[PDB]
Amino acid sequence: ISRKWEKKNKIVYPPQLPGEPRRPAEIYHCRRQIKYSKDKMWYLAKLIRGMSIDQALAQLEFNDKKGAKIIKEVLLEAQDMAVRDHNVEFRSNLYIAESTSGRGQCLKRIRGIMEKVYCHYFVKLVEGPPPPPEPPKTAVAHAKEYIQQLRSRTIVHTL
Amino acid sequence: QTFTFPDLFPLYSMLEEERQQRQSSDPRRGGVPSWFGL
């Protein structure tokens, strides 16, 4: 049992200078011991990994999976504590920076040992618009990289 | 004669006096501590 994710919300950064970019808010939340497999909840966690909070909530409210409701609840709680506890003025101005699942303390039952599986859902929200996805590299990027590779070659094994 | 079973079974001051002195968080303050007079 390690509970670092909870402790990650107690970091007090020093106050900033006027000539310094505004540090975006960072919120960490998790739910422990969810009666669900980490393998199944990995899909739901991956689905929402760069979405805005509103998009993620929309996606999860229409997933048929059991873990969708649980992740939705965790996200709503995170949004509430963001606006209230962590000084995030806009509910909309959040995005899922991190969304993973770990394994919990699973139980063992006798049938023939079978495992009652539990898991943790971890999320980190950051203040601001979701970062735009990386554009697919063009032919110009490919050609530039190839020419650089050609230019970087040396006369091997000599003076 | 007749019998019916009878109906048997028919420090906090400061806690309670501070219980009416919540002065709950004002929504319009937005997290700023209310202690300061500024």
Side-chain angles (χ1 to χ4, degrees):
Chain A
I1 171 148
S2 59
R3 267 37 188 187
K4 307 175 167 195
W5 210 245
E6 289 69 356
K7 286 179 225 315
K8 268 197 229 270
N9 268 334
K10 290 160 199 300
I11 298 157
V12 199
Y13 295 80
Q16 278 174 325
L17 300 83
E20 184 181 358
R22 220 171 99 93
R23 186 179 284 119
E26 265 214 275
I27 320 97
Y28 295 81
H29 204 230
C30 63
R31 167 153 313 158
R32 307 283 187 175
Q33 295 308 100
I34 315 177
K35 188 67 199 67
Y36 210 51
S37 78
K38 78 197 162 65
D39 318 73
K40 288 167 190 145
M41 189 105 81
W42 186 83
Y43 291 107
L44 294 138
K46 169 101 185 112
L47 164 75
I48 63 161
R49 254 180 193 166
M51 268 151 179
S52 62
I53 193 137
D54 287 349
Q55 179 91 353
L57 290 175
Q59 292 296 320
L60 292 166
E61 181 210 352
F62 288 114
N63 211 180
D64 288 335
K65 290 182 189 293
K66 177 194 175 119
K69 288 207 90 297
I70 322 190
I71 301 184
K72 210 186 168 283
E73 292 181 7
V74 172
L75 292 188
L76 292 169
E77 298 165 5
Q79 202 188 10
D80 199 55
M81 27 195 291
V83 152
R84 184 200 318 292
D85 288 358
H86 291 142
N87 200 52
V88 174
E89 77 173 332
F90 296 127
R91 300 190 331 196
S92 303
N93 216 22
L94 295 162
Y95 74 95
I96 293 91
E98 307 214 308
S99 98
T100 75
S101 83
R103 96 177 275 255
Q105 304 196 281
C106 304
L107 274 49
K108 279 182 186 174
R109 202 55 54 78
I110 323 302
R111 290 187 74 82
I113 312 289
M114 85 152 169
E115 218 196 43
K116 302 311 260 166
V117 291
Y118 290 83
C119 70
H120 312 310
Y121 177 68
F122 309 86
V123 79
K124 181 176 105 156
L125 298 176
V126 191
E127 218 203 3
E134 262 294 343
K137 60 186 304 183
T138 38
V140 197
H142 274 295
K144 169 166 327 308
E145 159 66 349
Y146 182 72
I147 299 281
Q148 296 189 13
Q149 282 187 14
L150 285 177
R151 297 254 194 202
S152 88
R153 47 191 179 149
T154 42
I155 316 179
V156 151
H157 288 319
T158 190
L159 281 204
Chain B
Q1 292 157 0
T2 271
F3 182 77
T4 68
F5 196 92
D7 195 357
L8 274 36
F9 322 94
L11 190 269
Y12 311 119
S13 63
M14 303 57 79
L15 278 314
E16 285 162 351
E17 279 159 351
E18 237 191 293
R19 276 176 184 170
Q20 58 73 39
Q21 186 47 297
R22 257 52 143 155
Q23 270 176 6
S24 71
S25 69
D26 175 277
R28 309 193 150 65
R29 285 312 271 174
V32 199
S34 314
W35 167 259
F36 289 93
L38 281 91

